[PDB]
Amino acid sequence: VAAKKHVPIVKKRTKRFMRHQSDRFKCLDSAWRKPKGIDNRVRRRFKGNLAMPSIGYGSNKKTKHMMPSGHKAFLVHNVKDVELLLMHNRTYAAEIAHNVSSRKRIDIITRAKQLGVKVTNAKAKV
Amino acid sequence: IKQLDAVYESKKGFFLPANIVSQADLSRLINSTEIQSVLRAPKGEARTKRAC
């Protein structure tokens, strides 16, 4: 069904925090690592450099963990898991685990449409 | 279930332990008349109105 009324979702930053020199070295994954060298310009926060993550980028407490539809994802593996969202169909949306077979997926989607629960990946294995 | 008492009485150097709490029902303890009759009046509610 439609989600519960909420404040607008505001993302302070949508770009990821890329690791320094990961764009030049293939042995460096792009996942964030804080520079610990004393002369590092990203660590010393010179202008024109990569930003570093900090708690000031944090998301709104009324809005954190919410998808753009206004729901929170709940991972389900079976019908007994999707029936835990009987009382939360306006705040939580079911998300079927990746290793659930197609028959069980049909069962979960049928039960979720009975309960009025949104499934985020209902088109899978069709 | 008849021999359990004799088993726990036959243990040397050990006794059934004394508890630090005699009445484990905190709701009865708090909402009893003996405590509630001497309490100060409430200074607010669960939800506080925003003043300004």
Place this chain on the structure above:
Amino acid sequence: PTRFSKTRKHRGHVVGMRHFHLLRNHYWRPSINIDKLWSLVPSDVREQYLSGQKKDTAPVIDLLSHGYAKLLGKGRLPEIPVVVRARYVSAEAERKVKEAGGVVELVA
């Protein structure tokens, strides 16, 4: 446990005399004060003695059976006659026993 160590947190950021042939069994004399003397009496008869159901009976205490050789004089005794059999005794302990009305017997 390894997982609670700070190193896992730091992952990423690095006269007189000489006595030849001393035998310690020569100098074995444990000591007990008179304030713990009634603790050597078993509990029930101790309670009877302290309450006063034994006005014609005096307890005899062997300190060597309990593991003591000298009776020392710290504390005070009640007004009960007690026979104490000990290898050693101090003057103040024996004096307080005589005030209490007992006698200190010397044994070996």
Place this chain on the structure above:
Amino acid sequence: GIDLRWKHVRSSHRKAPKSDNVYLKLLVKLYRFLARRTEAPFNKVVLRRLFMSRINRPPVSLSRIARNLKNGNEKKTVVVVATVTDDNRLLQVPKMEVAALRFTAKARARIEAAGGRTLTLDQLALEKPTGANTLLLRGPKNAREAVKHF
């Protein structure tokens, strides 16, 4: 920027026990309620002493309790937030009403034999919720080998 020569200081006292004892958690909840809803300083002191550790709660013996029972304190209820131990050097135990966190077996037996009463802290909260007619006692804090070698 703002010039702050002084610095705001975080609290240097315990707000919650480190113990995982669920009974102690229930006692802490009860005395939090009592300290918040009563004006008696006894409840606040008892809550703070429940927060403390073992070396900050030294044992209190029956000889110490009998010493503090003298001079008009014979009818007051003795409150110790630490354990109560037995003293063999005390031959005659006076009649007393003691509420403690815990008792040793000898201390409890000798109190009951002398004719007193042993209480827990929740029974103390039931009978004396404001700490009326109470004698709050502590043991010798500096009586440790570590404190001697300090």
Place this chain on the structure above:
Amino acid sequence: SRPTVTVFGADGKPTGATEVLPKVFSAPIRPDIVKHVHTGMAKNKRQPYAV
């Protein structure tokens, strides 16, 4: 008086017999101490390994 517990037969129905509950069932329930002792005894059947 102390509480009683019903004795059931081989048919799953009560036999009419009741027995006094032992005093160990009123002992304090201490999960922290149970965890400590369980952590201690779970290592007492281990076999050593070394290179």
Place this chain on the structure above:
Amino acid sequence: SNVSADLIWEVSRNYNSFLVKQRTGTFSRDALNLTNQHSRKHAGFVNDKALGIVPAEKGVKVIAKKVKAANKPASSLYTVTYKSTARKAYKAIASQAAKHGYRADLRQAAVARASAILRSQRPVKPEPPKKLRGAAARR
């Protein structure tokens, strides 16, 4: 004594077999749990008086704890099956939840769960067909 609902909550507040913990919330698989949330208010296995609502073939099935049969699990549940009008079901559920002081704080949650089950027992309307959108999906 040494056992109470407060103690059972202190024991099982961090872990029990009903607990379902994820990033976006903590749930409970209890039968006596209204709203399926892990809290002292809704821990039916913890609390001495508790309610639970289960769907039936038609209508709801409400179980309640019996205070005098706590140590007898086979006879500890008072069960009523409501296969009737929804308004009468809500009336009887609120009556057993609030009239005699048997967990009056669970009244709204119990009526809400009964309404949710009665909604779920309705026939499901067919979904509209998915519209293909854009360039690569459309062609």
Place this chain on the structure above:
RNA sequence: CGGGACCGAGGACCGCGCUCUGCAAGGAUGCUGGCGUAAUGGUCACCAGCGACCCGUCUUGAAACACGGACCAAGGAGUCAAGGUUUUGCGCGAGUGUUUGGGUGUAAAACCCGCACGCGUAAUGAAAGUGAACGUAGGUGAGAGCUUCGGCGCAUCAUCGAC
């Protein structure tokens, strides 16, 4: 008295008020239009304006010098034992420690047992040796808490005494 920009946090009522049928008074509502899909939004590649030295190590006050780095995968560096010490949790408590050993076992588990022994309960002296109450276990000044509202006074501190 106009003209313009940015913003709309909260979510039943309560309050302070006023111009008092109500209100601009403890946080935006009312009306209307187009569209209902890639239109908004997002990701990727590129162009444009502005910004932006190559990382690690070492040195001193600092740079500079110097050293390592063709690239990728996997491996790769504060560990364990014993002995102390401080702090935390727990059990018992003037005692405490079953597990050298014996009993038992569903068998390297779990359960049970007790003699000795270790540490603690007494110190001091090189040693022989001796060995801790004058007093409600002392007086005075503070001291949480309690109080019958006169005081009693925990821990602890300072000081004078006693053994």
Place this chain on the structure above:
RNA sequence: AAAGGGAAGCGCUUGUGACCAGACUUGCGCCCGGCGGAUCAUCCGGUGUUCUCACCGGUGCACUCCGCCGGGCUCAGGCCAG
């Protein structure tokens, strides 16, 4: 597929092209009309319970309850805006 007048790579912000995730499709409540049924109110007996609340069997005889189908009305509904 794209860029290239002696470096490329990176940050902020638009644009172009390519490719996408959502959201939405209507719900709820009244007034009528037409159907299909009596798990409507009261009363009686039994049973269980929280000891006054419910379930079960009879009683309803259709101005009462419960679903369905056609309309009408009110409210709430997506994106960008004045």
